[PDB]
Amino acid sequence: NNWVLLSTVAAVVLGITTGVLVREHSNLSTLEKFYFAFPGEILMRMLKLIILPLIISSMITGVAALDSNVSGKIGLRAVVYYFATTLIAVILGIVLVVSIKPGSTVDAMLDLIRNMFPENLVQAAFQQYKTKREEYKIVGMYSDGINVLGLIVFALVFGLVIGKMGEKGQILVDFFNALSDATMKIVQIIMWYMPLGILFLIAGCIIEVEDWEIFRKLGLYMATVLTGLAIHSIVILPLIYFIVVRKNPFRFAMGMAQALLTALMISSSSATLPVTFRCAEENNQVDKRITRFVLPVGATINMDGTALYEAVAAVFIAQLNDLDLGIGQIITISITATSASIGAAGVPQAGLVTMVIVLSAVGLPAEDVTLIIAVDCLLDRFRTMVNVLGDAFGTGIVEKLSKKELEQMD
Amino acid sequence: NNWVLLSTVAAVVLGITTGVLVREHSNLSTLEKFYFAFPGEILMRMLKLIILPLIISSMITGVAALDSNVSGKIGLRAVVYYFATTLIAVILGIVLVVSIKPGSTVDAMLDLIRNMFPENLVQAAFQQYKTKREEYKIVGMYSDGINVLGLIVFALVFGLVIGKMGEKGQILVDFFNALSDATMKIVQIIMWYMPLGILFLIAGCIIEVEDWEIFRKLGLYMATVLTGLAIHSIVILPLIYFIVVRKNPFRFAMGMAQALLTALMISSSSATLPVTFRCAEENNQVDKRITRFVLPVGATINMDGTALYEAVAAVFIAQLNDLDLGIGQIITISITATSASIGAAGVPQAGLVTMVIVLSAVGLPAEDVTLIIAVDCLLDRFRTMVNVLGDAFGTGIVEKLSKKELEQMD
Amino acid sequence: NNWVLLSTVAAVVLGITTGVLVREHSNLSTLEKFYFAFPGEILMRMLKLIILPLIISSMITGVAALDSNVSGKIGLRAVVYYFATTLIAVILGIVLVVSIKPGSTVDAMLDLIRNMFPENLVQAAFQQYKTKREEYKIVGMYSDGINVLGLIVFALVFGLVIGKMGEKGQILVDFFNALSDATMKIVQIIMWYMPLGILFLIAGCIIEVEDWEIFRKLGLYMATVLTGLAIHSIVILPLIYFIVVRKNPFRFAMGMAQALLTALMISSSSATLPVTFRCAEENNQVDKRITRFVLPVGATINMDGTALYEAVAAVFIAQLNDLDLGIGQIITISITATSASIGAAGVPQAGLVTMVIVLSAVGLPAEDVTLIIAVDCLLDRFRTMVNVLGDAFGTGIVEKLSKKELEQMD
């Protein structure tokens, strides 16, 4: 049976009830509040532990599985699809935030390019590079935080090289195939424990809210973000799927419902990858090669949810201050916020350090994060859900458009 | 011939003579004293270098060698045996320190649980996590020091997964078998050079003592620690072995004498692992699978020596201050000190950072370490000797109790 | 065709022209000067990224390819040749700097020995150990910077062990062979992009010079360094080659011209390794085993260029100050400067941190580096060229002297 998903839904409702009841009838200190959310912290720690080998081995295996003379077209189609979806999401978010009205960059882009080619493979696993101008000379240094962008680029190049090697790279191909399978099984073992961590995480999230008037004050900001995400998930993506693939998009969404729920629950596209693989390969008759190549790329560089969430939050923050913007300032903020997070799109994010960096770069005060940090728990899950839905639709579209390429391999 | 052990014994006696003669007839500055112990520092550095791959590959290989439907009972028996021995050692140490009379915790336990599941596999190889309460909110950060506990847990889970994989994980199994053999050979190469390092280490240890009245002042503390270790090694462990295995325990100890001497000399259970393997498999007719699985686990979570040494030292320090304790305070100190070192029990320890953390947590002053740091050289070697003796007895007991399981594999 | 080398030469001349024209006709701020050299920084970053796996896998593969009973003599001959060449270079540099007249150590040597045996394999990939005396007690700590010396020693020991293992180490041998080939191919991919980075690097180097009288002031220092390098490359090395191998040394140099140009262009002996392999194995009929073993060792511990460059620069700096030296002080400075860089001789060096450490140790002021940092761009390339020429001549000499050993393998 599907005991994991039912248990997780029961844990979610029980955690909501527990948080509400404890907040209403019990008074706890800050230390007790921190101690009440320990299982959720343990679950988040376990989820973080498995991100590196899973994504690295999946990328290498997916790239190496394709023929040398074929992978270029598939990759080109994937990047074109993701760029188009990100542009549409950016436009929709800008239009919605302008209409509803709810309420340094060069260094950031150069750092983004710098992180694509790290100076140390081992150091990139837990550290990132950043520069700042001081009196003017540029000074750079390394700070904690996994450099997923550089590891993904190196993994892609390495997978291409060992796929083109042939008989001399077969041992590496087999090694990374076995590593990918082992990481998948370990992820399943962690999924076994997930529900209790989710229960306590929801209870702690609800308990941490103290004012209870922040939700009332944050009117039309939740409405704006939710409306943008709903429009993107329900209208634009199914229309693109039907236009390219002459098939019903909602049967496709019905097949992926299990992965959609899982992603909505753990809020981690990279973690959900095994369920997405299974749903896309079994429930829908999508080729294994296309799925295994496209899905990690989507979990890495999908920016529709970021464009519909962080960009809107930034424009709302700028609107809170009497800092009336122009068309250029709004477009610059949306571009900076969307581009600054291109590296880490699958890892779980709670502190929104990328958006803090964006706020610092665009000159806005960095102390306004607290006014929206309370509702991040609710919004991030829907962001991840729409991200994985877009990834699945992209796998379907690329499989549709790669008929000749998949014919040559046979 | 056995030229390594005879050479090491000759080096030990020559180092004792050299240290005594240099202290008596020569006067050296602090810088010259530091320069006199350089070869011992080099030997310790080389021993530290080989701890990670050896323990990781040994754990993976030992776990993967067992059948999937069998390893649960073997692991359960091993943990039960180690828990029982640790409890007996704790009780004996408490009783002895109370009778002879020679002279924050929640955060520590939560950190112990946190380190079982690190957030980064690469970072866990050289860094550890720690939290502290400040004005109250909890703040955590990473500090230098290998996280053996997390690596051991991940290695166990990975070994189980790849053992259950079968034909798809055979390549990883072969890879880690070869890695384990290579690490063993490198350890043997280091053992070739060991004796000169031991000579200079003993000479430097003896030279560093300056007062020469600290030994007289530290009366009944050496007596207490040595009596506890001797009682545990000579009475309790052989009695348990004879009760479970109806055989003479001293022939077993006679067979393991080579590994016992080696462990007494280098004071590193993990380093002694190859000699322990050879003695337990050849001198005693113990099954290879049981040995290869139990011995790394013992080298990792054996706490009898820690309970008989650090706990007693802590109670002695608390007795030095006019800080008359109760039964609860003594039991809390013994439990905290024993549990805080569960991660690093095989690596060489000289600075006793774990006991410093324990003293900080139990509210005792941290400046009293110097009064006992002088005799650590002598006591740590006997602690390691009794630890490896307990590990060997545990291998024998588990092999005795696993007759049906070892019958199914055949 | 040879489009890469011709494109790189055209890029070099175009970068020289661009730098001269921009300096003469345009005025730029410091920030614009930094932004003008971004592609060169990206190229240097990519070159740095590939140094670790390439050198590690090449060392392991080269050591493991040789028979167990043979590799000792080959290694002995290689070390003897490198020691003799370094001694001759030291003598020549000292004599030239004394005649032309253009213008703490114990801790350094002990740190050099300490870095040969690191305490952590993972930490050695990006960190180094250093000690300092303070009031006297010695305090050590770790700082950023790859520890190539320790990794090379561990790789050599590991390669010997797995070569002696045989059928049980064949899987590791195959794994590292495949890894070496993959790293070579990735290096070739980077070489594809190299020329534009070289163009912008030369343009930025030329632009950064502002006084334009520093070249006139630095008279007889360029002359001394260039004369020493030219004498070493043209006279001493061909004479040694002809004395040992009764063959024309200039046909050998003509065969290696492609690798010589490449090394002169990128100034990185380790990066040039694939071209050196191809030229030495195809253009000259040198045995593959001798080449694959000797060349990484030369790229790691070749000190002729360092002895002819850093030692002379240090003596020139000491001559600038009215600090008249003796024979012992000059020999101590040359020995310290040559020995302090034994670890990193193949990686690209621009900041000359090793020479800064040498200046700090020998008591000379550390602020005089700026007076010679301007001409480092020009001199380092010739230093690397003579280093790779010496490495190739060493491969030839060792192949000549290893006739019996290469006969036994057949």
Q: How far apart are CA A128 and CA A141, in angstroms?
A: 8
Phi and psi at C153, nearest 5°, equal: -65, -45
B157 and A181 within 8 Å at the Cβ level: the answer is no
Length reported for chain C = 410
Return the bridge partners of A142, or none. Answer: A129
Reduced to 3 states, what is the DSSP secondary structure of residue A364?
coil
Length reported for chain A = 410
Return the bridge partners of B152, or none. Answer: none
Burial (CB count within 10 angstroms: exposed 0-12, middle 13-18, buried 19+), residue A213: exposed
Q: How far apart are CA C263 and CA C244, in angstroms?
A: 25
Which tokens hold the place of A387? 């991200």
Strands B127-134 and A137-144 come out as unpaired
Neighbours of C86 (CB within 10 A): 22
Reduced to 3 states, what is the DSSP secondary structure of residue C367?
helix
**Is residue B193 less than 8 Å (CB to CB) from chain C?**
no
Element (H or E) spanning A138, and its range?
strand A137-144
| Residue numbers preceding breaks in chain C (C to N > 2.5 A) | 103, 135
Reduced to 3 states, what is the DSSP secondary structure of residue C121?
coil
Listed in sequence order, the residues at least 6 apart from C373 whose beta carbon sits closer than 8 Å to its beta carbon are C352
Listed in sequence order, the residues at least 6 apart from C311 whose beta carbon sits closer than 8 Å to its beta carbon are C90, C93, C94, C97, C333, C334, C337, C338
Listed in sequence order, the residues at least 6 apart from B183 whose beta carbon sits closer than 8 Å to its beta carbon are B50, B53, B54, B57, B58
CA distance C185 to chain A (A): 7
Q: Which residues of B42-57 are buried (b: 16+ CB within 10 A; e: fewer)?
A: bbbbbbbbbbbbbbbb
Provide, as residue numbers in chain A, all residues whose Cβ is less than 8 Å from the Cβ of B169. Answer: 178, 181-182
Which residue bears the tokens 């996280």? Answer: B147
Burial (CB count within 10 angstroms: exposed 0-12, middle 13-18, buried 19+), residue B218: middle
Return the bridge partners of A129, or none. Answer: A142
Q: How far apart are CA C143 and CA C208, in angstroms?
A: 29
B175 and A175 within 8 Å at the Cβ level: the answer is yes
> What's the number of CA atoms in the CB half-sphere (13 Å) around residue C229?
25
Smallest CA-to-CA distance from B280 within B131, B390, B152, B194 is with B390
Annotated binding site of C for Na(+): 82, 85-86, 298, 300, 302, 304, 341-342, 344, 387, 391
Q: Which CATH superfamily is domain A3-409 in?
A: Sodium:dicarboxylate symporter (1.10.3860.10)
Q: How far apart are CA A339 and CA A109, in angstroms?
A: 8
CA distance B132 to chain A (A): 11
Q: How far apart are CA A3 and CA A8, in angstroms?
A: 8
Annotated binding site of B: 82, 85-86, 267, 269, 298, 300, 302, 304, 306, 341-342, 344, 347, 383-384, 387, 391
**Is residue B242 less than 8 Å (CB to CB) from chain A?**
no
Annotated binding site of B for L-aspartate: 267, 269, 306, 347, 383-384, 387
- Domain boundaries defined on chain B: 3-409
CA distance A133 to chain C (A): 9
Burial (CB count within 10 angstroms: exposed 0-12, middle 13-18, buried 19+), residue A369: middle
Over its C-alpha atoms, chain B yields an Rg (Å, rounded) of: 22
C178 and A157 within 8 Å at the Cβ level: the answer is no
A136 and C30 within 8 Å at the Cβ level: the answer is yes
Chain Cα centroid distance, residue B406: 29
Q: How far apart are CA B323 and CA B309, in angstroms?
A: 20
Max distance between CA atoms of chain C, in angstroms, equals 68
Smallest CA-to-CA distance from C128 within C113, C118, C139 is with C118
134-163 of A, contacting C, C-beta below 8 A: 136-138, 142, 154, 157-158, 161-162
Q: Is residue B12 within 8 Å of residue B198, measured between CB atoms?
A: yes
Smallest CA-to-CA distance from C321 within C376, C364, C370 is with C364
Chain Cα centroid distance, residue B112: 17
Neighbours of A396 (CB within 10 A): 24
Listed in sequence order, the residues at least 6 apart from A257 whose beta carbon sits closer than 8 Å to its beta carbon are A279
Listed in sequence order, the residues at least 6 apart from B206 whose beta carbon sits closer than 8 Å to its beta carbon are B15, B16, B19, B20, B23
Q: How far apart are CA C182 and CA C188, in angstroms?
A: 10
Phi and psi at A145, nearest 5°, equal: 135, 125
Q: How far apart are CA C242 and CA C251, in angstroms?
A: 11
Resolution limit, Å: 2.5
Q: Looking at this protein, which amino acid is placed at residue B314?
A: A
Return the bridge partners of C133, or none. Answer: C138
Helices (H), C50-169: 51-64, 71-100, 105-116, 148-165
Residue of B28, B31, B45, B176 to mutate for C, most C C-beta atoms under 10 A: B45
Annotated binding site of C: 82, 85-86, 267, 269, 298, 300, 302, 304, 306, 341-342, 344, 347, 383-384, 387, 391
Smallest CA-to-CA distance from C266 within C197, C354, C186, C344 is with C197
Which tokens hold the place of B18? 């050299």
Q: Measured between CB atoms, which of C113, C114, C172 is closest to B178?
A: C172
Reduced to 3 states, what is the DSSP secondary structure of residue C256?
coil
Listed in sequence order, the residues at least 6 apart from A179 whose beta carbon sits closer than 8 Å to its beta carbon are A53, A57, B172
Which tokens hold the place of A84? 């188009």
Q: How far apart are CA C324 and CA C220, in angstroms?
A: 18
Task: Tell me how far CA of residue B178 lies from CA of B59, B61, C64, in angstroms.
Answer: 13, 10, 14
Q: How far apart are CA B85 and CA B304, in angstroms?
A: 7
Closest-CA residue in chain A for C46? A117
Listed in sequence order, the residues at least 6 apart from B220 whose beta carbon sits closer than 8 Å to its beta carbon are B100, B101, B102
Element (H or E) spanning A140, and its range?
strand A137-144
Which tokens hold the place of C164? 């002696």
CA distance C125 to chain A (A): 7
Subunits with 3+ Cβ pairs within 8 Å of B are A, C
Reduced to 3 states, what is the DSSP secondary structure of residue C158?
helix
Burial (CB count within 10 angstroms: exposed 0-12, middle 13-18, buried 19+), residue C25: exposed
Smallest CA-to-CA distance from A277 within A187, A175, A378 is with A187
Provide, as residue numbers in chain B, all residues whose Cβ is less than 8 Å from the Cβ of A37. Answer: none
Q: Is residue A94 within 8 Å of residue A330, measured between CB atoms?
A: yes
B182 and C158 within 8 Å at the Cβ level: the answer is yes
Provide, as residue numbers in chain B, all residues whose Cβ is less than 8 Å from the Cβ of A35. Answer: 106
Dihedral-angle region of residue A324 (phi above 0 means left; psi in -120 to 50 means alpha; beta otherwise): beta
Burial (CB count within 10 angstroms: exposed 0-12, middle 13-18, buried 19+), residue C73: middle
The separation between the first and the last C-alpha atoms of chain C, rounded to the nearest angstrom, is 36
Reduced to 3 states, what is the DSSP secondary structure of residue C71?
helix
Residue of B52, B109, B120, B153 to mutate for A, most A C-beta atoms under 10 A: B120
Residue of C33, C42, C49, C171 to mutate for A, most A C-beta atoms under 10 A: C49
Q: Is residue B262 within 8 Å of residue B268, measured between CB atoms?
A: no
Task: Tell me how far CA of residue C239 lies from CA of A101, A219, C88, C280, in angstroms.
Answer: 82, 85, 13, 19
Phi and psi at A343, nearest 5°, equal: -80, -55
Return the bridge partners of B311, or none. Answer: none
Q: Is residue B64 within 8 Å of residue B159, measured between CB atoms?
A: yes
Q: Measured between CB atoms, which of B122, B168, B171 is closest to A126?
A: B122
C123 and B122 within 8 Å at the Cβ level: the answer is no
Q: Is residue C279 within 8 Å of residue C391, measured between CB atoms?
A: no
Residue A150 assigned as binding residue: no
> What's the number of CA atoms in the CB half-sphere (13 Å) around residue B107?
18
Q: Is residue A204 within 8 Å of residue A40, measured between CB atoms?
A: yes
Residues C314, C315, C319: CA angle, nearest 5 degrees: 115
Q: How far apart are CA C280 and CA A92, in angstroms?
A: 61
Q: Measured between CB atoms, which of A117, A171, A172 is closest to C45?
A: A117
Phi and psi at B210, nearest 5°, equal: -115, -40
Chain Cα centroid distance, residue C96: 22
Question: 3-state SS of chain B?
Answer: CCHHHHHHHHHHHHHHHHHHHHHHHCCCCHHHHHHHCHHHHHHHHHHHHCHHHHHHHHHHHHHHCCCCCCHHHHHHHHHHHHHHHHHHHHHHHHHHHHHHCCCCHHHHHHHHHHHHCCCCCCHHHCEEEEEEEECCEEEEEEEECCCHHHHHHHHHHHHHHHHHHHHHCHHHHHHHHHHHHHHHHHHHHHHHHHHHHHHHHHHHHHHHCCCCCHHHHCCCHHHHHHHHHHHHHHHHHHHHHHHHCCCCHHHHHHHCHHHHHHHHHHCCCCCCHHHHHHHHHHHCCCCHHHHHHHHHHHHHHCCHHHHHHHHHHHHHHHHHCCCCCCHHHHHHHHHHHHHHCCCCCCCCCCCCHHHHHHHHHCCCCHHHHHHCCCCHHHHHHHHHHHHHHHHHHHHHHHHHHCHHHHHHHC
A168 and C178 within 8 Å at the Cβ level: the answer is yes
Return the bridge partners of B133, or none. Answer: B138
Phi and psi at B220, nearest 5°, equal: 65, 0
Task: Tell me how far CA of residue C227 lies from CA of B291, C85, C87, C254, in angstroms.
Answer: 66, 17, 17, 21
Chain Cα centroid distance, residue A5: 21
CA dihedral B202, B207, B213, B219 (to 10 degrees): -10
Neighbours of A291 (CB within 10 A): 24
Provide, as residue numbers in chain B, all residues whose Cβ is less than 8 Å from the Cβ of A174. Answer: 171
CA distance A357 to chain C (A): 21
> What's the number of CA atoms in the CB half-sphere (13 Å) around residue A134?
4
Task: Tell me how far CA of residue C299 lies from CA of B110, C66, C231, C234, in angstroms.
Answer: 49, 19, 21, 20
Provide, as residue numbers in chain B, all residues whose Cβ is less than 8 Å from the Cβ of A124. Answer: none
